[PDB]
Amino acid sequence: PGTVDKKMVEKCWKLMDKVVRLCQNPKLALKNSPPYILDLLPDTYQHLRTILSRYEGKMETLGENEYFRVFMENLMKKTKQTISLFKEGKERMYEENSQPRRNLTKLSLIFSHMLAELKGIFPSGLFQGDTFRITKADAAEFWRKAFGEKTIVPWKSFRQALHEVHPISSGLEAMALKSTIDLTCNDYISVFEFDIFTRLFQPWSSLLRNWNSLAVTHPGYMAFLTYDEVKARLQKFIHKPGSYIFRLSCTRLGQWAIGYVTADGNILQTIPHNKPLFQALIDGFREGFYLFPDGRNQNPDLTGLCE
């Protein structure tokens, strides 16, 4: 990760504008719903302009910060990816079912995550990474013992430190995990990505079992969806009361949301109330609300995850 200066920021800014102009092609018909790249990139620009404003006169201090160097490096790469995606994709960028368009959708989520991370670490344009409050006490004590006040660590270091407390059984399991926790796809784990992951897959004591049971082996899991997409997905099961799905929100990272079909033909969305998601799923099945994940007749029994 190389030192950042004004020239690099100006470079990234021009690359972001070209991605914007590419995404303004009317042949794209980009949906006005999150993640919305036409807002995210201008918002990333405006937040970077704010950070620089805070560090005017101490620009040497901002440019050596490890988190910031890794971030700008990743921002440049992801914009170059997107430009190249349009170049290689040609007319297929305008068929939604295409590999290129699906990859644009993936990159729009990544830009959303990067902006949320950057605002988490630079709340008002000031670096606060070394004082980031990790939400779950057990997870916070893990990060402090292993990494102290560090804001970001290489993936290999994170994997090694995690393995000591939660063994990772195989390189296969390791790459599946990295895919879930490395939200910004930069081969680092920030304290922010760690906070999100451990909020989603609490309690810490069974972290990887929670993650496998919810993100890998559960057919009701839908990854990132909007509110509207939850309704559209359940619409085919509108007359099967008890059909349900659960999903992530790119506007509220670290939060789970649930959608379910009522007995009277309505789709409602809710969150787990003061309890891990798997407990809400266990309770919802027993109470007759969450019976058929994505409409399916068989439902994972998460009861084994309780202690």
Binding site: N32, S33, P34, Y36, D39, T226, Y227, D228, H239, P241, G242, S249, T251, R252, A257, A263, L268, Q269, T270, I271, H273, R286, E287, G288, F289, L291
Partner: protein, 90 residues
């Protein structure tokens, strides 16, 4: 024999049962007619919640009897749904 079940909407539904039918069988009949999952159903008759394992003649429920089909600081379900919807405001 037929018995009646009044739902929360004021709807009276008519079931064909036997005195030996369990409360679980009745809820299954209600699902057949209304689509309500049995675990979402609570049945009330003559001041008592009816238990799943017991039968109709256990509760002395006769032909043409009528049964009734039925967190602090929380959001209502509609308020919760509206809130989640607003997460996606642009």
């Amino acid at each position: 024999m037929q018995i009646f079940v009044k739902t929360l909407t004021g709807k009276t539904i008519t079931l064909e049962v036997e005195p030996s039918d369990t409360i679980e069988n009745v809820k299954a009949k209600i699902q057949d007619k209304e689509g309500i999952p049995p675990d979402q159903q609570r049945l009330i008759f003559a001041g008592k919640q009816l238990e799943d394992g017991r039968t109709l003649s256990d509760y002395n429920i006769q032909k043409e009897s009528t049964l009734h089909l039925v967190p602090g600081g929380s959001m209502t379900v509609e308020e919760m749904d509206s809130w989640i919807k607003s997460w996606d405001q642009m």
